[PDB]
């Protein structure tokens, strides 16, 4: 869509290139199909990952948490709020400097048209703008 928050425009690329792409897969989820990828802490008496031997993978923890300012920020430099009514946009009228709107999936075509018309006149960014309404 190629849009950016004006307050961060000259900084956003540093921020984006700085985000981690680490994944914390569950131990041995690569060995048997019955174990999903979702993280669970290992609790075995012998387990090599719990005991932190070199060569085993890394475990999650507080050290990896991002700085408080950068956290929750989308790649366009805004935070997101969910909307499903015309009367919801009315809340964003004070916050449009830092927040943007994302219309919920279940809202149908006829109603979406009414949301977008209101978004234009109030000056609010909607990130699902194209959505289903491309046809």
């Amino acid at each position: 869509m190629d849009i950016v928050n004006p307050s961060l425009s000259k900084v956003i690329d540093i921020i984006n290139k700085g985000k981690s792409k680490k994944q914390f897969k569950r131990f041995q989820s690569w060995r048997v199909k019955r174990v999903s990828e979702s993280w669970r802490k290992p609790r075995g008496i012998d387990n090599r990952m719990r005991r932190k031997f070199g060569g085993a993978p890394d475990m999650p923890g507080i050290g990896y948490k991002k700085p408080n300012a950068i956290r929750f920020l989308l790649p366009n430099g805004y935070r997101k709020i969910m909307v499903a009514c015309v009367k919801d946009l009315e809340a964003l009228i004070s916050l449009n400097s830092f927040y943007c709107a994302e219309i919920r999936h279940a809202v149908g075509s006829k109603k979406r048209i009414e949301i977008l018309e209101r978004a234009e006149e109030l000056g609010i960014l909607v990130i699902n703008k194209e959505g289903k309404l491309v046809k």
Binding site: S7, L8, K10, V11, I14, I15, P67, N68, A69, I70, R71, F72, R79, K80, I81, M82, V83, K87, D88, E90, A91, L92, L95, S97, F98, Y99
Partner: protein, 165 residues
């Protein structure tokens, strides 16, 4: 207040973010680079980078911070008037006695290039003029004309910093 905002929005006071943005910008700002002192009008120099590398040329002026202006000899070695980063020049102890009337500007010689300029060569009045000045200082001198024609070659048998230029 409407229920969408009383929960989601609560994560951060985002009014603080401008202060963070400034501090981050400061930290990743480039360091300064020093303008050199060692070069005098009419010094011969050797080009180290880009399409004209290996040739001797004559230094004319500082231009735009680290940018400097040089002339080849379109008759002798075919190189015209150009601009380059002043660090891409190796100094040598020969100085010609040229003095110029006015400031002039030319295309930059970027470090990354795709293709050679084998053809399409022409000259301006100022290129003509400056050649017809430089040439006078060169004609009177013994082997100087040939000196400008042979490319430079680094000695492959001794450490560079042992040699003098």
């Amino acid at each position: 207040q409407r229920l969408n905002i009383s929960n989601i929005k609560n994560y951060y006071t985002a009014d603080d973010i401008p202060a963070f943005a400034e501090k981050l910008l400061e930290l990743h700002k480039p360091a300064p680079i020093e303008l050199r002192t060692d070069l005098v009008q009419g010094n011969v120099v050797v080009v180290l980078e880009g399409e004209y590398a290996s040739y001797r040329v004559v230094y004319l002026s500082r231009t735009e911070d680290n940018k400097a202006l040089c002339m080849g000899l379109p008759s002798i070695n075919g190189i015209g008037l150009f601009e380059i980063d002043e660090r891409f020049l190796l100094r040598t102890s020969i100085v010609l006695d040229i003095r110029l009337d006015k400031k002039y500007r030319a295309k930059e010689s970027k470090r990354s290039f795709k293709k050679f300029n084998t053809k399409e060569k022409v000259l301006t009045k100022e290129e003509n003029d400056i050649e017809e000045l430089l040439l006078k200082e060169i004609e009177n001198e013994k082997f100087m004309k040939k000196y400008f024609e042979t490319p430079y070659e680094i000695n492959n048998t001794v450490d560079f910093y042992e040699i003098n230029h």
